[PDB]
Motif scaffolding. Structure first.
Motif, PDB file in Angstrom:
ATOM      1  N   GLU A   1       0.795  -1.231   0.000  1.00 11.10           N
ATOM      2  CA  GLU A   1       0.000   0.000   0.000  1.00 11.10           C
ATOM      3  C   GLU A   1       0.833   1.291   0.000  1.00 11.10           C
ATOM      4  N   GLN A   2       2.133   1.236   0.328  1.00  9.50           N
ATOM      5  CA  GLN A   2       2.983   2.431   0.360  1.00  9.50           C
ATOM      6  C   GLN A   2       3.300   2.996  -1.035  1.00  9.50           C
ATOM      7  N   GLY A   3       3.542   4.303  -1.086  1.00  9.40           N
ATOM      8  CA  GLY A   3       4.260   4.971  -2.169  1.00  9.40           C
ATOM      9  C   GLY A   3       5.769   5.025  -1.906  1.00  9.40           C
ATOM     10  N   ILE A   4       6.558   5.289  -2.955  1.00  6.98           N
ATOM     11  CA  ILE A   4       8.011   5.530  -2.817  1.00  6.98           C
ATOM     12  C   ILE A   4       8.254   6.730  -1.884  1.00  6.98           C
ATOM     13  N   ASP A   5       7.424   7.772  -2.016  1.00  7.45           N
ATOM     14  CA  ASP A   5       7.492   8.990  -1.201  1.00  7.45           C
ATOM     15  C   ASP A   5       7.297   8.719   0.306  1.00  7.45           C
TER      16      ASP A   5
END
Lengths: 120, 41
Positions: free
Chosen positions: A89-93
């Motif tokens: 569920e995470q973004g790279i940001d």
């Protein structure tokens, strides 16, 4: 329980049932319930710490993504990313501030996590 | 940069991009669908 000499949850979980039944006011059903609660408390404590850092829960779930060392799994779990689903569920940001995680390595791990969770 | 560039990319290609979650992909689809466009044209 403390006056009868019990100081730890481990003693209550593992001591012979006869010693707990010698305590005035304990019946066999109440001793069984007390032992089950002590074992469940010991299990919960272990699981909670293993998810907070990278002992077992995040050292298997969050570390499923190929490339996750135990240190990185504990750094992820310190951000609340405890499972392989949480990482998918995470973004790279969201991971860019983790010391030792480059944007490319973050992107590879998120994609590995998504491949297992969403396409396995 | 352009809507015509976005419409050519497949959903599987957009999921490889950095900082691109499942939520942001659903937002892009819902917005493209509101304009009668679909990914992969």
């Amino acid at each position: 329980l403390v006056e009868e000499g019990f100081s730890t949850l481990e003693e209550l979980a593992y001591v012979p049932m006869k010693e707990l039944l010698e305590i005035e006011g304990l019946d066999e059903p109440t001793v069984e319930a007390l032992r089950e609660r002590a074992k469940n408390a010991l299990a919960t404590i272990a699981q909670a710490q293993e998810e907070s850092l990278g002992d077992n829960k995040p050292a298997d779930d969050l570390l499923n993504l190929e490339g996750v060392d135990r240190d990185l799994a504990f750094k992820l779990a310190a951000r609340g990313v405890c499972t392989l689903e949480d990482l998918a569920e995470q973004g790279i940001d969201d991971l860019a501030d983790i010391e030792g995680l480059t944007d490319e390595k973050a992107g590879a791990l998120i994609m590995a996590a998504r491949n297992i969770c969403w396409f396995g | 940069h352009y809507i015509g560039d976005l419409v050519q990319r497949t959903e599987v290609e957009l999921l490889k991009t950095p900082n691109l979650g499942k939520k942001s992909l659903t937002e892009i689809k819902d917005v493209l669908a509101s304009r009668g466009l679909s990914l992969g044209m």
